[PDB]
Design a protein around this ligand. Sequence first.
Ligand SMILES: [Mg+2]
Ligand SMILES: [Mg+2]
Ligand SMILES: [Mg+2]
Ligand SMILES: [Mg+2]
Ligand SMILES: [Mg+2]
Ligand SMILES: [Mg+2]
Ligand SMILES: [Mg+2]
Ligand SMILES: [Mg+2]
Ligand SMILES: [Mg+2]
Ligand SMILES: [Mg+2]
Ligand SMILES: [Mg+2]
Ligand SMILES: [Mg+2]
Ligand SMILES: [Mg+2]
Ligand SMILES: [Mg+2]
Lengths: 188, 260, 59
Amino acid sequence: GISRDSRHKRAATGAKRAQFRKKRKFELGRQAANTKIGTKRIHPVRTRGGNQKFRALRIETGNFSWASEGVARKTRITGVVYHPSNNELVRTNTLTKAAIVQIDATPFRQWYESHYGQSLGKTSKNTERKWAARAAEAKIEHAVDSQFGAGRLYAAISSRPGQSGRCDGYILEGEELAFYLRRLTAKK
Amino acid sequence: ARGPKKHLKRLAAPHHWMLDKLSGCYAPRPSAGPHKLRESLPLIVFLRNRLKYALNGREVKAILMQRHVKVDGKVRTDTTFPAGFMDVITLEATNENFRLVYDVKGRFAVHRITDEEASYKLAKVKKVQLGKKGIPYVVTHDGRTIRYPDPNIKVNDTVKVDLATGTITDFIKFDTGKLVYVTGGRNLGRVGTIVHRERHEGGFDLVHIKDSLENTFVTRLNNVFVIGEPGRPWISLPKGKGIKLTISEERDRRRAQHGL
Amino acid sequence: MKLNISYPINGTQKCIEIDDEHRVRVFYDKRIGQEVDGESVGDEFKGYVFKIAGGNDKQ
RNA sequence: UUCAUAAUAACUUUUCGAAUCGCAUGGCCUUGUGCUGGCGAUGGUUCAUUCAAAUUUCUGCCCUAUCAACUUUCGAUGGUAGGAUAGUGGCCUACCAUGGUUUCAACGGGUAACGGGGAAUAAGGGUUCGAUUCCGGAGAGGGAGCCUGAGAAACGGCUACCA
RNA sequence: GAAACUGCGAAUGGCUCAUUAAAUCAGUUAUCGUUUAUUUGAUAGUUCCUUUACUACAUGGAUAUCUGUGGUAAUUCUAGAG
Ligand SMILES: [Mg+2]
Ligand SMILES: [Mg+2]
Ligand SMILES: [Mg+2]
Ligand SMILES: [Mg+2]
Ligand SMILES: [Mg+2]
Ligand SMILES: [Mg+2]
Ligand SMILES: [Mg+2]
Ligand SMILES: [Mg+2]
Ligand SMILES: [Mg+2]
Ligand SMILES: [Mg+2]
Ligand SMILES: [Mg+2]
Ligand SMILES: [Mg+2]
Ligand SMILES: [Mg+2]
Ligand SMILES: [Mg+2]
């Protein structure tokens, strides 16, 4: 099997090392999960010392965080748009860590509406009062707002889906988001 | 090679078992327990090779079974149970109580003790941390975890555990000019005062120790076990009060105290 | 071709040999877990319907 | 230290939180067979610890130049991100950079080389030996590959090929 | 108290030195870089989900041995039924 040993490697000097000891189970490494989008399918793998890692071959949903607001919502992932490591992955639609994906965003929008009442694209008294107490806090980065109008938000996955089975991340914000956008533009 | 080792060869044993070179190929390997393998002392050794109450392993086993040996109040039935430093071994019949303390030379000494002291165990502090639900716990260098400790108990401080329940009754802060016991190295079994504590923030603090006879020596911090305020120890120390004589001196003593 | 007949309602078992391949031909290219009538098996077995389940090859 | 730990957000093909055993047969009467209660076994959560574990720092190996250049398409040295792993790491993958080692012997070759504690010799310095009772490490005809498990790439386990 | 299920162990021990020359190994560090049955300490009123009639004085279906019917020249081969 795939082994993470440094035995098979050459030394710093470039010397080809001799074959001492046949590969061990503590050196072992398993096949890549390389998770796809659509219909939840999670295979558990028995690791060292008991314990399970969860291979996430085919994932659809994920809970993503809006770090500015301080809220996270369970939402559908619809397509990988950019991945820093490989364009092949993007082509495939391979969900991994640090991949950039499009989120259904509707739940986020709903949450926003509940909170401030301002809406994106264009009742009780206590609620009104609450809204009044807030406001001006509801401004947001323009890019995010624009994205909302289309209905699909850019988010980065921060979970390792091949490890946890869980697919999670953060909605793209500030400078990083801008950078990502620029990259995307360049690619096109 | 493949999982844990389960045997111990007779030569590979700790030397302070005082185990004879012959009469067997194997030594009694201390089971997973409160004390470290090399720093421990298995019950079998204590029974057979110290007090001589048993003649062989079978005898020891038999003794154990009738629920009579007690390590720190709790019963025990393992032949290879690792009772270590400060552990109180109580035998119900005989009514003898023992505390496992080192002697001037290095090995574990048979130290007979009264029931008034046998009630408590003295223990060094290894770790101080907040556990789950923010609850503070102390870790004794001798096995235990004690929840909700007095919050000015730090690392290296020694603690009087009441043993019957397992609560901290009192403690000694680690400081200069406090009676100390050495539990590792060449200086193991020696009693002293702590003159000075060197730091070297990076690797291994060294403590300077003077004994009663004004005779200074240096050991690592993790080998040093506080015992009280100078001249007044919290436990009874064994005969020769952890003093270390020179060889010639020892010889002289042997000669002059002849009474055959 | 030997047969191992078992009746689960009573909990009774019997072993019956057939000396003719014509009487066994009913079983040829049938799968385990199928319904086979007794009529074509034997003139003795009438109104019977066997579940073929398990068996042994020569050797 | 982005630690211990706590807090808000949610998530989860929602892990665990005792439908388990032996001997005791004790205490209040609301006089039920009621409510109770002792010493233990096994279990089970995370944190300890202990027996361990993988790696890992610095320094040290025997002859040989009738081995002076070696490594880098097929990872060599470094970066970035991911994958994988118990976890660190070119360990592997993508994109990028052109490094890394060497006359203070790299690399190659040999060993009738397992390493060490040690052994023989015995002014001082040395020389030769160490398959072998202890400690490490490898291997179970050869090579692979795995299952079970806390732990094995196990061979008095399995699967294949070659002999 | 045979058998069988379950649990645990069979990764220790024992042997051998083929490979192996910065590898192993020795002394020395490190894990703020991890896994760890067992051990000895710790430890979980919150499983409920609206709160006028509900399994908890205790839930479900299996399967081993066993009894019977066999297969094969054969093996610590196991089919079928109860
Ligand atoms: Mg675990
Ligand atoms: Mg440190
Ligand atoms: Mg943290
Ligand atoms: Mg990385
Ligand atoms: Mg050889
Ligand atoms: Mg040699
Ligand atoms: Mg040797
Ligand atoms: Mg040889
Ligand atoms: Mg052979
Ligand atoms: Mg093998
Ligand atoms: Mg054999
Ligand atoms: Mg073996
Ligand atoms: Mg069994
Ligand atoms: Mg072995």
